[PDB]
Curated annotation (Swiss-Prot):
It is found in: Virion; Host nucleus; Host mitochondrion. The gene is PB2. This is Polymerase basic protein 2. Belongs to the influenza viruses PB2 family. Plays an essential role in transcription initiation and cap-stealing mechanism, in which cellular capped pre-mRNAs are used to generate primers for viral transcription. Recognizes and binds the 7-methylguanosine-containing cap of the target pre-RNA which is subsequently cleaved after 10-13 nucleotides by the viral protein PA. Plays a role in the initiation of the viral genome replication and modulates the activity of the ribonucleoprotein (RNP) complex. Influenza RNA polymerase is composed of three subunits: PB1, PB2 and PA. Interacts (via N-terminus) with PB1 (via C-terminus). Interacts with nucleoprotein NP (via N-terminus). Interacts (via N-terminus) with host MAVS (via N-terminus); this interaction inhibits host innate immune response. Disulfide bonds: none annotated.
Length: 163
């Protein structure tokens, strides 16, 4: 069960899931209908300039270990992972003027509209994701919302591995 999303090939390595169509509110209090995968799953994300191991529970990213060509390649894989996770803080980061999803055509994908939104500017996404203190794990570094490597702090659940 290998699928494609945001230029990444996802491949499930553990867990299972059932789908539930659900309604969610953005930071602009706009209702989106999304197809939610319920169940704890693990995936490999393989792209041309980045790779990752993604561990996730229903609408919640548990951990993401990213490896890539450079900061831009890695941020790109982080954005895809955060949108794919379907986390409330990612949905609530959709806010402000013009930041609305065209839902007049119900066949269109709100996940692809969330992705386009965060690909343009992930600043609100990364700042609203939350940060956390990080453990020892040498060879794995933390990454701040501005993509600065840190040994003391990181975006919640996100770690950068050496390529």
């Amino acid at each position: 069960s290998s699928f494609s999303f945001g230029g990444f090939t996802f491949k499930r390595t553990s867990g299972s899931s059932i789908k539930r169509e659900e309604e969610v509110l953005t930071g602009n209090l706009q209702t989106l209908k999304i197809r939610v995968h319920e169940g704890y799953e693990e995936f490999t994300m393989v792209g041309k300039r980045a790779t990752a191991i993604l561990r996730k529970a229903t609408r919640r990213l548990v951990q993401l270990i990213v490896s890539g060509k450079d900061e831009q390649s890695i941020a790109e894989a982080i954005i895809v992972a955060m949108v794919f996770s379907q986390e409330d803080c990612m949905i609530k980061a959709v806010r402000g003027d013009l930041n609305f999803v065209n839902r007049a055509n119900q066949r269109l994908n709100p996940m692809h509209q969330l992705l386009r939104h965060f690909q343009k500017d992930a600043k609100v996404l990364f700042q609203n994701w939350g940060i956390e203190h990080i453990d020892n794990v040498m060879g794995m570094v933390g990454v701040l919302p501005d993509m600065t490597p840190s040994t003391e702090m990181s975006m919640r659940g996100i770690r950068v591995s050496k390529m």
